Each structure stands twice: as C-alpha cells, then as structure tokens.
C-alpha cells in the first residue's frame, strides 16, 4: 500500500527535514517559564498553564515523563516543521531541568473548553465549522509529510468563545515514507482504524481520516465514543457490527491479511447497518443526508477509499463554512 496523495513529500525534501534523529536540540532558559496551574495529563506528559516571566504572556508548559531520546526528537522535529500551519499548536521553546534533565515543551497558550461539556452545546453549523478547521490542520500536516496518528477530541483544543481550534499532542506523529511498515500501537482505541486492528503496518495519512470520521460520528449522533470497544479485538467487533463483515472480508482479501483465528471467531458475521439506524430525538437536528454522505465517505475499511483531508474540505456538507470564509 502507498498513500494516494503526498506520497513523495519526504522523498523530495532534504534528508534533514525528516531525519529527526540527527536533530540537535537548542535548549532555552527554564527560568523564563513558570507553572501557574495543572490543566492536563496523560501517559507521556503533564500539562500546565504557565507564564513567560519576561513578557507576562500565557503559555502551555508540557512536562515530559521519562522518554527515549529518539521519541522526544521525533515530536520536536515534527512540531518545528509544522509550526505556523493552520490550526497547528505552536511550539515556542524547549527547556529542561538541569539536575533531573526533565524536558518541558513550551507552546502558545490555548484557552480550551472540556469537549465532554462543549460538544452537547454545539449547533449543527458549529460542528461543520470546527470539523472544517480540523481538516485544515490535517491537510496541512499530511502535505508536509506527517501523520498525526492520535486524532481524538482530547487532542483538539477548542476555545468556543473565540471559535478557535488547535490540533495538539504530536507525540505519536510520524513522517510518511512510501512502503514503510509502522507500529500499529498508535491512536486511542476508540479512534483506531481497521488497518491498526488487523495489523496492516504499511498505512498512511488516511489513518487520520478514519479517526476524524469516528469523532464526526460521535458529534452528529451524540454517541461518545461512537465505536465503544473494551480492547483492540472488541474494537474491530464494534466496527464490524456497523460496517458489516462482507466489507471486512473484501478488505482483508485485497491486502492479503488473515485475521488471528481468535479475532476471526469474535468478529463473527454481521450485516451492514444503515447510518440512519443511529438517529434519535437528541441528535436529530444535527443529522442530514449531507452529514451521512460525508461520514460514509470517511468510515470505510479500506484506507485507500477514504476521502483525503483536501477532498473532505470540498464536500458540500461544508459549503456554508467555505462561503463564510470567502468573505
Ligand atoms: O499533550 C500535549 O501535547 C499538550 N497538551 C495536553 N493538554 C493540553 C492542553 Br489542555 C492544551 Br490547551 C495544550 Br495548548 C496542550 Br499543547 C496540551
């Protein structure tokens, strides 16, 4: 398998663009940044609102938990390469503690609202608008030879008062090289594409479009998360019960993949459910043939058949967002 767009971005660029192991980190001054309050945490970092003591401007300080040199360089290089792109979080400095060597990444501040409380209040137009803004970020990173590989609501910061969005946490992101076999232990379970779940390692930017489609399904159907598996096997089952097993077998045969027999046994046999099986009273104002059409074109087993992010931006579901942007 090869990406159908942007396959040659790293082939054409200087080796230094993508050879992140050759990066020499240029450390700033740790005392320029002071922690104000904790705002997030995860397996690989704790996140704080901070202040730059020189100019009294807010920032975000991401303090990294113990990590290999290779992995920190990958995230720094990808952030450096993407800084300035539409709706991409901006890495401003990189510092570390002298005694422990604990590194902190310093970002422009973003004033986010908890998605679990925000999404119930978004109107149909707001869903179209924020998904468009997220697609700007995905088409940009893909155009720069990068897959994010962890798109989920937790990594999409939205300041709803200011209608501003940033795609954050580039810690799982990778450069795309044609034919490379990648680790499938990426993304959050509920957003993992079928490629990860069936061990197709030569995947590409289209992985991010499956994760996007799971986010979008969750928003328009008001079902968080949309595919609610308890482990990676159960995740494929939850997908197969919606998309049907016929499509799955076609996919598996095309890429000459066989399922582990236990996984095969769990998946069983399922007809394709129609997307309208999911509409109900709470979500009804958000669900339309344009939304379903757009969703159906993202949630395909075959990663080669999904819309690209640039194709998604042009889908008529977004016509009003485009028209508004034009003036
Ligand atoms: O995980 C990350 O990269 C950083 N991270 C975690 N929670 C984060 C929040 Br809340 C904001 Br606002 C920003 Br900006 C980043 Br950057 C965050």
From Swiss-Prot:
It comes from the Eukaryota. Keywords: ATP-binding, Kinase, Nucleotide-binding, Serine/threonine-protein kinase, Transferase. GO terms for biological process: DNA damage response; regulation of cell cycle. It is an enzyme of class 2 (transferase). SMART domains: S_TKc (SM00220). ATP binds at residues 39-47, 62. One of its GO terms (molecular function) is protein serine/threonine kinase activity. The active site is at 150 (proton acceptor). It catalyses: L-seryl-[protein] + ATP = O-phospho-L-seryl-[protein] + ADP + H(+); L-threonyl-[protein] + ATP = O-phospho-L-threonyl-[protein] + ADP + H(+). The keyword ATP-binding applies. Residues 33-318 form the Protein kinase domain. PROSITE patterns: PROTEIN_KINASE_ATP, PROTEIN_KINASE_DOM, PROTEIN_KINASE_ST. Pfam families: Pkinase. Its EC number is 2.7.11.1. Tetramer of two alpha and two beta chains (possible). This is Casein kinase II subunit alpha. It comes from Zea mays.
């Amino acid at each position: 398998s090869k990406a159908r767009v942007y396959a040659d971005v790293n082939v054409l660029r200087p080796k230094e663009y993508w050879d992140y192991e050759a990066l020499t980190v240029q450390w700033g001054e740790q005392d320029d940044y002071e922690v104000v309050r904790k705002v997030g945490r995860g397996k690989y970092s704790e996140v704080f609102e901070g202040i730059n003591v020189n100019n009294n401007e807010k920032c975000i300080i991401k303090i990294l938990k113990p990590v290999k040199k290779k992995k920190i360089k990958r995230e720094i290089k990808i952030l450096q390469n993407l800084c300035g792109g539409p709706n991409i979080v901006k890495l401003l400095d990189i510092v570390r503690d002298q005694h422990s060597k604990t590194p902190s990444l310093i970002f422009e501040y973003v004033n986010n609202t908890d998605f679990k409380v925000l999404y119930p209040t978004l109107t149909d137009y707001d869903i179209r608008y924020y998904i468009y803004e997220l697609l700007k970020a995905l088409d940009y990173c893909h155009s720069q030879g990068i897959m994010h590989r962890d798109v989920k609501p937790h990594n999409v910061m939205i300041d709803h008062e200011l209608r501003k969005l940033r795609l954050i946490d580039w810690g799982l992101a990778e450069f795309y090289h044609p034919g490379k076999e990648y680790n499938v232990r990426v993304a959050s379970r509920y957003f993992k594409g079928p490629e990860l779940l069936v061990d197709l390692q030569d995947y590409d930017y289209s992985l991010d479009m499956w994760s996007l489609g799971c986010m979008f399904a969750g928003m328009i159907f008001r079902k968080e998360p949309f595919f609610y598996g308890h482990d990676n096997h159960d995740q494929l089952v939850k997908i197969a019960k919606v998309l049907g097993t016929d499509g799955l077998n076609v996919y598996l045969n095309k890429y000459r993949i066989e399922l582990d027999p236990q996984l095969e046994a769990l998946v069983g046999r399922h007809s394709r459910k129609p997307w309208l099986k999911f509409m109900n009273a709470d979500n009804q104002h958000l669900v339309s043939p344009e939304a379903i059409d757009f969703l159906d074109k993202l949630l395909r087993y075959d990663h080669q058949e999904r819309l690209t992010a640039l194709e998604a931006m042009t889908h008529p579901y977004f016509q009003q967002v485009r028209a508004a942007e034009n003036s």
